[PDB]
Amino acid sequence: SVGIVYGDQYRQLCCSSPKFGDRYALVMDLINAYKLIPELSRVPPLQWDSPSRMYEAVTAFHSTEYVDALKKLQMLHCEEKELTADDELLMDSFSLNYDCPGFPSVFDYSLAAVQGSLAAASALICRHCEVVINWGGGWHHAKRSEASGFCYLNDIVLAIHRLVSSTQTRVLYVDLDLHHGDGVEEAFWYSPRVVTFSVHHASPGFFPGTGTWNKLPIFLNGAGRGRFSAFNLPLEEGINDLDWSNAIGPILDSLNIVIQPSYVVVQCGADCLATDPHRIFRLTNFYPSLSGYLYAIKKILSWKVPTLILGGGGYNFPDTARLWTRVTALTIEEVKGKKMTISPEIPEHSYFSRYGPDFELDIDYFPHTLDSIQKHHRRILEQLRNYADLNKLIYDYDQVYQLYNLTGMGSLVPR
Amino acid sequence: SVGIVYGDQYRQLCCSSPKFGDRYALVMDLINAYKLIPELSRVPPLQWDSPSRMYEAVTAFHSTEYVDALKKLQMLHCEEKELTADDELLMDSFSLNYDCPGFPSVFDYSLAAVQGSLAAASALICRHCEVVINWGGGWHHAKRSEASGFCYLNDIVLAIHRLVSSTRVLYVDLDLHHGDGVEEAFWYSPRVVTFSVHHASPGFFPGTGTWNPIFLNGAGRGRFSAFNLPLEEGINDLDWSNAIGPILDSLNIVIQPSYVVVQCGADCLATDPHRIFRLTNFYPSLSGYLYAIKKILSWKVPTLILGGGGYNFPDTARLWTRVTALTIEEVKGKKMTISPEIPEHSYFSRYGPDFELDIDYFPDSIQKHHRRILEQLRNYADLNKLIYDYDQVYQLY
Amino acid sequence: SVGIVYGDQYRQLCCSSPKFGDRYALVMDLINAYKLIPELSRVPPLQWDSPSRMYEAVTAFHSTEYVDALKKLQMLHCEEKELTADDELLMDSFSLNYDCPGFPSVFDYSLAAVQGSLAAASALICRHCEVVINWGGGWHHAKRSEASGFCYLNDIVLAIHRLVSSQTRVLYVDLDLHHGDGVEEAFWYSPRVVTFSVHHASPGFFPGTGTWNPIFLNGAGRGRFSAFNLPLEEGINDLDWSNAIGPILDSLNIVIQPSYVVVQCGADCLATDPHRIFRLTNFYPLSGYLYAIKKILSWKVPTLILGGGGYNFPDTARLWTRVTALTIEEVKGKKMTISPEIPEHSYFSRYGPDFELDIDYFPDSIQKHHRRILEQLRNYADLNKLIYDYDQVYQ
Amino acid sequence: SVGIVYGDQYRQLCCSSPKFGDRYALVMDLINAYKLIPELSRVPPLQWDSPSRMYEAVTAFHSTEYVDALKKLQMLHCELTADDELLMDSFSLNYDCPGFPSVFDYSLAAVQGSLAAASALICRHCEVVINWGGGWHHAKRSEASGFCYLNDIVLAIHRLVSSTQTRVLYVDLDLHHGDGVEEAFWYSPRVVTFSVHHASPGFFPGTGTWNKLPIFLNGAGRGRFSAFNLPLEEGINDLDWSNAIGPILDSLNIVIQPSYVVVQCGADCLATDPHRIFRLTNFYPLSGYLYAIKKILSWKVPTLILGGGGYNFPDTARLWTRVTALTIEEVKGKKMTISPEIPEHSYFSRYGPDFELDIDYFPHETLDSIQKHHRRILEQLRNYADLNKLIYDYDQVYQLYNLTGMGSLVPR
Ligand SMILES: Cc1ccc(C(=O)NO)cc1NC(=O)c1ccccc1
Ligand SMILES: Cc1ccc(C(=O)NO)cc1NC(=O)c1ccccc1
Ligand SMILES: Cc1ccc(C(=O)NO)cc1NC(=O)c1ccccc1
Ligand SMILES: Cc1ccc(C(=O)NO)cc1NC(=O)c1ccccc1
Ligand SMILES: [K+]
Ligand SMILES: [K+]
Ligand SMILES: [K+]
Ligand SMILES: [K+]
Ligand SMILES: [K+]
Ligand SMILES: [K+]
Ligand SMILES: [K+]
Ligand SMILES: [K+]
Ligand SMILES: [Zn+2]
Ligand SMILES: [Zn+2]
Ligand SMILES: [Zn+2]
Ligand SMILES: [Zn+2]
């Protein structure tokens, strides 16, 4: 059973932010126009029995004071009058400004992603779905008491918290977004049962600045009982589908062999696409060379582990919809063993005109030694050996070796 | 609203240099130990959407090859290998050597201050704040293609170039050293008037900002637009205040600036290891710096306050804590009571052995300069068709 | 109409190189001796408003540091002194050495072909001409940052890039003795520019590509199956060459339906070329060159005709004069009667000792290549969702 | 007496081309708005008594067939066959020199103004005459070029140089090499041409620079050494450009002793021209233009001043309005004070956002000097004197260059 989070008020709320506009509607309507919706079990967003139980949900991670401020910020923007000087200072103390502005639905918008991702986690826990997709979720930058990068509430941390708290349970979190998932990584920095792994761009001045090097420089990788449980693969700009795929594949499989997660949570932000306005990575949604996204999603799904698939970044809205519609059809193929054929021409529906000038499903893009990252593979596998050692897990050197030996790189695997 | 630039990562990068060590952490911890942070609006450092975007922002002043050299220098110092002869040559052609050495975070360190001062300028432009403080910035010696005086990227030039493009800007440089990089950058520009007061003497860094014999003061349309007041060693709070006060008043009258940018280098302090001037951080005579910031703040012009020099780190923290409280008093009106005793906190033991907020100090050529400077202001107002009562301004001296 | 690139400055620049000498003058002056210029529209070479504009045009394909190196190489050869060891290393790193030497005008000479071929692309685009000829152009071996085969700037790539950015699909046909690797390489990832080169290929023969690699490479990414090659053994004649390429040209037209055709017409396949590899002629009773040009022109697609190789200068002039007259005839519908004797003119002595227009010459593997190429065409059209009658093509 | 070519029909024709639009109207109206017109003697464009007299005037330089084709192109646009297309392309009546309804009247008008201006110099009615509708220096005998269809400079110089020992000095300040004027007089020693310009690979028109060590061609036959060229790299400012041509101009005046000077004063060297090559200004406290014009007028030689290029139309008018006031000042000895604010007139709105007379530009600065060109040029000047049997006043030329410290560059 493949689940997906949708609902009438859920779509209105998801589409009510100044930065993301109607992106969620495009995604779900393109999925709908390709007739995928009948294949999928609709997962209704969680609702609560009182503000108290809701406040209790959100404050499992977020400070009560930051939640109150996020609520006040919404009420303020729904009245005509301006913020007082004290209002200003309180919002700034929570970074409720600049790149995380207030707007009339900012709290309802932020809560909706939490409702969706918590409901998604619950459908996995009680084994109603093997996989659940939430294209309204994935806000990986939000901190305990800080908004960041248009992330006001961290649905991912809250969904993971519910998975680990369900009745030796380990979660593997995989962050494919163009940006470092600092918010998820920071929340579980001291926790061995949530192993985070983000692949991303990092360069000086690039948001948010972490997920890379810090006497020679070093990678911090978690602390205390969490030492070695935070993994990062920072990559230079310009990477294509094959090199990104080759970069994370063996790492993904090695993490799965050693962590043995009970659940996998995948943040699947689409700003790595070549046609994203960031213009940094050069990934595609192509499907016969092959989209590194689809390659990674197919590999994770092959592990047969209950999985949550989340959205995230993606600022070319039509191309984000093209990629996540393919990710959704792939998930249906892999889980249900059911062939999903997707016509190259965008079907008739009410957002058809946004897919111009081509109205095709492939993004409108033409892909065209020394850039290798074998010392990162070696660093990360030694980190994996340390994690297994510190947590007294089996480390199957032979299985990890054979994997990397498929690409002639067994010599990077430590014993 | 008074803004102050800070962040976790930004504090980490400002404290990673060999020459300024942990000074920014002491400054921001004394400000916080005095409960000033709740009064202040946190301004986060600017971040960019791509490498191309950051490069576009920095080569708005610096040359691309100088930026590549500086980033190359960081990568080399993040390896264990010694530089090749060819790479020593490349770094030497950009003065990335001697007093501007490489170190493992030299590029992130340099850029952090640009991020800090660019965000501060943006906050003033969209009118989020009336004043912004950035104690991690103020690197006034860097040139387009050249490090100098431990300044690798000129965050002041970039911030001024952002304000003057949103309009005249008055730049005020209180540092012991001449602000030559800022003055050079706007040498041909009438809409950025620069005014530096400083020590100058034969062989004293950087060597400019004095008689050259006659005084140079801008070129092209920017003629008469760079102002300089050099002073002999030994000057105290009151004489320094009296030498600078009338010049500040006359520039504001005649120029009518849209923004004021103040470099507030703390190496004029009597306890700085340069031991050249005798300024204090006393708020009752009155500190030269506090007198100056208060006057500039009296103008109600949106103002950037930046750091700079200052090599006695606890006394720089003592000076800039008072400047921060004063800015809060003058902008919000909210009286600021600072205990004379250093509050307990992480760095409390650095403020030994006395743990007082006051620094531990026991306290004609200028008239000829005033004559010449007023003549140059008159010349500037002439050339730029500005309207001013030459008699009200003449009365200021 | 039919356009031809020329100009006095252009002619002086195109004749300033050590390797092709005054070939361009022989070409253009045989064309004039035969009273063909009044039938042709003169296309002046493009000129730019500033150094920056010239640089923006040329670095559409070439790297800036390569353009910088090329202009520095010209300056150095206008000085008396030797190059420094460091300057030699610099030029080596862009292969500005050996068969791509410096000389006093190497940059102005190279750029002139770009000026002519861009002006010719533009005359096609605004529709002033149906066909344009540039016998000073056709330097198909230059790469993004590398001279090769006396090609310093790839004028074809820049012309083709101007035509595709004017949905536009361009067919490039390369009849030169050598594989057009630079043009092929430039559009390796692009399905909108389909490249077809026929050439000699054999072990050790320049530049090495355009043949079994074993299998044939033919493009990558969305350009897969979009680079076509027909390598041929030495000694082939007009009729075997014609039968070899004739069906491939027709099939490419039917299936790609190109918006423009760009034809490189290097004359080093001639029997009398000092390469002495192919046995093609300039005979119009039939010259393989005239057969292919006439086939290509019968398609009525706006067409760019370019020069290229050709190292027997009077015999290249004989072929290119016949190509020009034929293009006039095929386009305007108006017979062009060319005397079998060379008319008198400034360069008449070069055509001795017989002074005649005909060049002085007495005149299954391919089935495997046709089946390979027909299958690759099918893969191309299928990958590009182009509609076409497979059976009509296979005939 | 300073003359200026103007007339009602003349304004209309000069304003009727697609490429230059109303540029001539902004120029003359700004001169008018600064009140310079009463100081100037209006010089009416020349008219002829028949088509044949007109055609005789124009074919003193241009071929019969090129003029005939140019007339046809204008008649054609007032209503093309494939042979009309071929005919026009044989004269480069295409691309950068297209046809338009008035292309012949437009082209003829500049001839009419420059010849009338020459005539006013010849008969001593004026010491100097300005024509801002003229200066089309690229047009060839049988070829339109660079939006020049008829070469009014060539025809004007030919009238001067044949009026009753007579030599003309032609000075071309335009951004571009004056190829059309240089080619016309290439075999003639009595018209000495000097062009300063940008030249670089691919920049129009390509001549006026280097051509075994490369060489400068400089005339042929009796005209050997009579064509001077100074090509400059991009970025030159008012002072470097002033120092580059000042001494060459003074030396040319000293050695050649011209009876008339003709100055093409094309404005595309302005920093604000769309070409963005040179960084000249119109500033006047110093503009290289105003510097060079002041220097030429100080020789007290009857002088014709022509327009040319200039594709920022308000800034072209700001330059040429200053050139006009300075000519009045230098020739009549009469102070011409021009206010910094553009005066009120129908085109006032075209000088925004500043509405000031100084162009809106901010200037800002061994190995970029051109002292070898001075040496090459002074040697060519000495060769011209020899060939033509003129006195070469070494001491005066030397004293001239030793003002800068460069006497050592002067040949004996
Ligand atoms: C500023 C920022 C911060 C965070 C994220 C993000 O998606 N993180 O996962 C994205 C952004 N990017 C943007 O807001 C953006 C939008 C359009 C063009 C370029 C950039
Ligand atoms: C060498 C130098 C260069 C520039 C600046 C400066 O602060 N410029 O604004 C300061 C210095 N001074 C010093 O670095 C210094 C440090 C400790 C004791 C004495 C001097
Ligand atoms: C070495 C080379 C490289 C490229 C090309 C060429 O024409 N490519 O299109 C031709 C050559 N051939 C020659 O340069 C050559 C010249 C004369 C006699 C024999 C050979
Ligand atoms: C193509 C041309 C040809 C000749 C001349 C010229 O002024 N010669 O004196 C000028 C040009 N320049 C231009 O036509 C031009 C116009 C506007 C912007 C950029 C360029
Ligand atoms: K990521
Ligand atoms: K963890
Ligand atoms: K100072
Ligand atoms: K200035
Ligand atoms: K070929
Ligand atoms: K191709
Ligand atoms: K000129
Ligand atoms: K001459
Ligand atoms: Zn992102
Ligand atoms: Zn200092
Ligand atoms: Zn060849
Ligand atoms: Zn010009």
mmCIF file of N, CA, C and O in Angstrom, chain A residues 135-183:
data_model
loop_
_atom_site.group_PDB
_atom_site.id
_atom_site.type_symbol
_atom_site.label_atom_id
_atom_site.label_comp_id
_atom_site.label_asym_id
_atom_site.label_seq_id
_atom_site.Cartn_x
_atom_site.Cartn_y
_atom_site.Cartn_z
ATOM 1 N N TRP A 135 4.100 15.526 -0.149
ATOM 2 C CA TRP A 135 4.742 16.589 -0.921
ATOM 3 C C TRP A 135 4.519 17.975 -0.333
ATOM 4 O O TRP A 135 5.115 18.934 -0.828
ATOM 5 N N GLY A 136 3.674 18.104 0.690
ATOM 6 C CA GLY A 136 3.599 19.322 1.469
ATOM 7 C C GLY A 136 4.584 19.411 2.622
ATOM 8 O O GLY A 136 4.677 20.459 3.258
ATOM 9 N N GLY A 137 5.346 18.349 2.899
ATOM 10 C CA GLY A 137 6.250 18.324 4.028
ATOM 11 C C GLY A 137 7.712 18.471 3.618
ATOM 12 O O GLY A 137 8.059 18.584 2.447
ATOM 13 N N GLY A 138 8.580 18.485 4.628
ATOM 14 C CA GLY A 138 10.004 18.411 4.351
ATOM 15 C C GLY A 138 10.784 19.637 4.772
ATOM 16 O O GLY A 138 11.824 19.943 4.198
ATOM 17 N N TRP A 139 10.314 20.328 5.813
ATOM 18 C CA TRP A 139 10.861 21.636 6.176
ATOM 19 C C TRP A 139 12.033 21.472 7.152
ATOM 20 O O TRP A 139 11.937 21.726 8.363
ATOM 21 N N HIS A 140 13.178 21.079 6.589
ATOM 22 C CA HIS A 140 14.290 20.543 7.366
ATOM 23 C C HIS A 140 15.158 21.600 8.039
ATOM 24 O O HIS A 140 16.040 21.218 8.816
ATOM 25 N N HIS A 141 14.950 22.899 7.792
ATOM 26 C CA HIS A 141 15.798 23.914 8.426
ATOM 27 C C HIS A 141 15.283 24.438 9.762
ATOM 28 O O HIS A 141 16.053 25.074 10.488
ATOM 29 N N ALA A 142 14.015 24.225 10.101
ATOM 30 C CA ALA A 142 13.462 24.856 11.298
ATOM 31 C C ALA A 142 14.121 24.280 12.559
ATOM 32 O O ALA A 142 14.370 23.069 12.651
ATOM 33 N N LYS A 143 14.452 25.163 13.508
ATOM 34 C CA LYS A 143 15.128 24.794 14.754
ATOM 35 C C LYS A 143 14.147 24.773 15.925
ATOM 36 O O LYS A 143 13.023 25.265 15.838
ATOM 37 N N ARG A 144 14.610 24.223 17.048
ATOM 38 C CA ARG A 144 13.806 24.220 18.268
ATOM 39 C C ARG A 144 13.177 25.588 18.554
ATOM 40 O O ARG A 144 11.977 25.683 18.834
ATOM 41 N N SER A 145 13.962 26.666 18.473
ATOM 42 C CA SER A 145 13.434 27.991 18.792
ATOM 43 C C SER A 145 13.754 29.012 17.710
ATOM 44 O O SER A 145 13.911 30.195 18.015
ATOM 45 N N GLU A 146 13.812 28.589 16.445
ATOM 46 C CA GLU A 146 14.246 29.490 15.386
ATOM 47 C C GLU A 146 13.642 29.063 14.058
ATOM 48 O O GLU A 146 13.719 27.890 13.685
ATOM 49 N N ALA A 147 13.055 30.016 13.344
ATOM 50 C CA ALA A 147 12.706 29.808 11.949
ATOM 51 C C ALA A 147 13.942 30.006 11.066
ATOM 52 O O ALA A 147 14.806 30.834 11.350
ATOM 53 N N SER A 148 14.029 29.225 9.996
ATOM 54 C CA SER A 148 15.183 29.326 9.113
ATOM 55 C C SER A 148 14.805 28.849 7.720
ATOM 56 O O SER A 148 14.185 27.789 7.588
ATOM 57 N N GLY A 149 15.187 29.622 6.699
ATOM 58 C CA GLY A 149 15.086 29.193 5.310
ATOM 59 C C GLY A 149 13.687 28.802 4.887
ATOM 60 O O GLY A 149 13.465 27.743 4.294
ATOM 61 N N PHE A 150 12.738 29.678 5.211
ATOM 62 C CA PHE A 150 11.299 29.459 5.064
ATOM 63 C C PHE A 150 10.822 28.161 5.728
ATOM 64 O O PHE A 150 9.761 27.636 5.371
ATOM 65 N N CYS A 151 11.555 27.644 6.720
ATOM 66 C CA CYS A 151 11.081 26.542 7.560
ATOM 67 C C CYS A 151 10.746 27.095 8.945
ATOM 68 O O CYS A 151 11.640 27.546 9.680
ATOM 69 N N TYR A 152 9.458 27.056 9.296
ATOM 70 C CA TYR A 152 8.985 27.574 10.577
ATOM 71 C C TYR A 152 8.751 26.482 11.607
ATOM 72 O O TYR A 152 8.939 26.718 12.803
ATOM 73 N N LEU A 153 8.343 25.297 11.173
ATOM 74 C CA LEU A 153 8.119 24.166 12.055
ATOM 75 C C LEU A 153 8.694 22.946 11.362
ATOM 76 O O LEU A 153 8.547 22.782 10.145
ATOM 77 N N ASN A 154 9.384 22.115 12.119
ATOM 78 C CA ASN A 154 10.168 21.047 11.511
ATOM 79 C C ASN A 154 9.313 19.779 11.514
ATOM 80 O O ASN A 154 9.403 18.943 12.407
ATOM 81 N N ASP A 155 8.477 19.631 10.491
ATOM 82 C CA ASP A 155 7.681 18.417 10.391
ATOM 83 C C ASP A 155 8.550 17.163 10.373
ATOM 84 O O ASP A 155 8.137 16.117 10.893
ATOM 85 N N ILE A 156 9.745 17.239 9.782
ATOM 86 C CA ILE A 156 10.596 16.056 9.693
ATOM 87 C C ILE A 156 11.016 15.581 11.092
ATOM 88 O O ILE A 156 10.887 14.396 11.426
ATOM 89 N N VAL A 157 11.511 16.493 11.936
ATOM 90 C CA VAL A 157 11.909 16.094 13.285
ATOM 91 C C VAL A 157 10.720 15.492 14.022
ATOM 92 O O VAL A 157 10.836 14.458 14.691
ATOM 93 N N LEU A 158 9.553 16.103 13.891
ATOM 94 C CA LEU A 158 8.403 15.585 14.620
ATOM 95 C C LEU A 158 7.970 14.214 14.085
ATOM 96 O O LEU A 158 7.621 13.325 14.871
ATOM 97 N N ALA A 159 8.031 14.004 12.759
ATOM 98 C CA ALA A 159 7.659 12.699 12.202
ATOM 99 C C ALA A 159 8.646 11.614 12.616
ATOM 100 O O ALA A 159 8.238 10.479 12.910
ATOM 101 N N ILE A 160 9.950 11.948 12.629
ATOM 102 C CA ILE A 160 10.989 11.022 13.077
ATOM 103 C C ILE A 160 10.813 10.694 14.556
ATOM 104 O O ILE A 160 10.905 9.532 14.966
ATOM 105 N N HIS A 161 10.553 11.707 15.379
ATOM 106 C CA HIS A 161 10.355 11.461 16.804
ATOM 107 C C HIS A 161 9.245 10.442 17.038
ATOM 108 O O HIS A 161 9.378 9.553 17.888
ATOM 109 N N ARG A 162 8.157 10.529 16.264
ATOM 110 C CA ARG A 162 7.063 9.571 16.425
ATOM 111 C C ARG A 162 7.462 8.172 15.962
ATOM 112 O O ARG A 162 7.058 7.182 16.581
ATOM 113 N N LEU A 163 8.259 8.065 14.889
ATOM 114 C CA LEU A 163 8.751 6.758 14.451
ATOM 115 C C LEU A 163 9.690 6.119 15.482
ATOM 116 O O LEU A 163 9.549 4.929 15.793
ATOM 117 N N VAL A 164 10.686 6.865 15.994
ATOM 118 C CA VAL A 164 11.599 6.230 16.957
ATOM 119 C C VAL A 164 10.879 5.863 18.253
ATOM 120 O O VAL A 164 11.228 4.866 18.889
ATOM 121 N N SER A 165 9.867 6.638 18.660
ATOM 122 C CA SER A 165 9.116 6.374 19.888
ATOM 123 C C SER A 165 8.078 5.260 19.758
ATOM 124 O O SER A 165 7.392 4.978 20.745
ATOM 125 N N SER A 166 7.919 4.647 18.583
ATOM 126 C CA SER A 166 6.979 3.547 18.407
ATOM 127 C C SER A 166 7.625 2.227 18.813
ATOM 128 O O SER A 166 8.815 1.997 18.568
ATOM 129 N N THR A 167 6.833 1.356 19.421
ATOM 130 C CA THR A 167 7.367 0.106 19.945
ATOM 131 C C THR A 167 7.622 -0.899 18.821
ATOM 132 O O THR A 167 8.769 -1.255 18.548
ATOM 133 N N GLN A 168 15.574 -0.418 20.217
ATOM 134 C CA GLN A 168 16.126 -1.177 19.102
ATOM 135 C C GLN A 168 15.601 -0.620 17.777
ATOM 136 O O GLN A 168 15.992 -1.065 16.691
ATOM 137 N N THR A 169 14.685 0.342 17.878
ATOM 138 C CA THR A 169 14.140 0.994 16.698
ATOM 139 C C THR A 169 15.098 2.092 16.261
ATOM 140 O O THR A 169 15.382 3.025 17.025
ATOM 141 N N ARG A 170 15.608 1.967 15.040
ATOM 142 C CA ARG A 170 16.487 2.958 14.445
ATOM 143 C C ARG A 170 15.840 3.515 13.189
ATOM 144 O O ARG A 170 15.217 2.774 12.417
ATOM 145 N N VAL A 171 16.002 4.824 12.998
ATOM 146 C CA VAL A 171 15.551 5.526 11.809
ATOM 147 C C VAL A 171 16.774 5.971 11.011
ATOM 148 O O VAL A 171 17.767 6.433 11.583
ATOM 149 N N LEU A 172 16.725 5.781 9.694
ATOM 150 C CA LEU A 172 17.705 6.336 8.770
ATOM 151 C C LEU A 172 17.057 7.512 8.066
ATOM 152 O O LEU A 172 15.998 7.354 7.449
ATOM 153 N N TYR A 173 17.666 8.686 8.177
ATOM 154 C CA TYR A 173 17.166 9.896 7.536
ATOM 155 C C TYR A 173 18.105 10.291 6.400
ATOM 156 O O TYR A 173 19.314 10.457 6.618
ATOM 157 N N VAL A 174 17.544 10.445 5.201
ATOM 158 C CA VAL A 174 18.307 10.669 3.970
ATOM 159 C C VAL A 174 17.815 11.975 3.358
ATOM 160 O O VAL A 174 16.643 12.084 2.975
ATOM 161 N N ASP A 175 18.711 12.950 3.240
ATOM 162 C CA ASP A 175 18.360 14.319 2.852
ATOM 163 C C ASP A 175 19.000 14.613 1.491
ATOM 164 O O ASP A 175 20.200 14.897 1.411
ATOM 165 N N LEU A 176 18.198 14.546 0.419
ATOM 166 C CA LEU A 176 18.684 14.738 -0.948
ATOM 167 C C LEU A 176 18.594 16.181 -1.426
ATOM 168 O O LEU A 176 19.038 16.484 -2.539
ATOM 169 N N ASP A 177 18.050 17.068 -0.603
ATOM 170 C CA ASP A 177 17.911 18.476 -0.928
ATOM 171 C C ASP A 177 19.252 19.110 -1.314
ATOM 172 O O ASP A 177 20.303 18.765 -0.780
ATOM 173 N N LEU A 178 19.195 20.114 -2.191
ATOM 174 C CA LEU A 178 20.385 20.897 -2.506
ATOM 175 C C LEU A 178 21.072 21.468 -1.269
ATOM 176 O O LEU A 178 22.283 21.721 -1.298
ATOM 177 N N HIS A 179 20.342 21.641 -0.164
ATOM 178 C CA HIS A 179 20.877 22.301 1.022
ATOM 179 C C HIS A 179 21.090 21.302 2.157
ATOM 180 O O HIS A 179 20.401 20.286 2.257
ATOM 181 N N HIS A 180 22.066 21.594 3.009
ATOM 182 C CA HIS A 180 22.306 20.775 4.189
ATOM 183 C C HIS A 180 21.083 20.753 5.111
ATOM 184 O O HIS A 180 20.583 21.804 5.527
ATOM 185 N N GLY A 181 20.625 19.554 5.465
ATOM 186 C CA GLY A 181 19.548 19.445 6.441
ATOM 187 C C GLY A 181 19.922 19.730 7.890
ATOM 188 O O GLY A 181 19.731 18.877 8.767
ATOM 189 N N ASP A 182 20.434 20.940 8.153
ATOM 190 C CA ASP A 182 20.953 21.284 9.478
ATOM 191 C C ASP A 182 19.917 21.091 10.592
ATOM 192 O O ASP A 182 20.260 20.645 11.695
ATOM 193 N N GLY A 183 18.648 21.431 10.329
ATOM 194 C CA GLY A 183 17.620 21.310 11.364
ATOM 195 C C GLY A 183 17.381 19.879 11.837
ATOM 196 O O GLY A 183 17.242 19.621 13.037
#
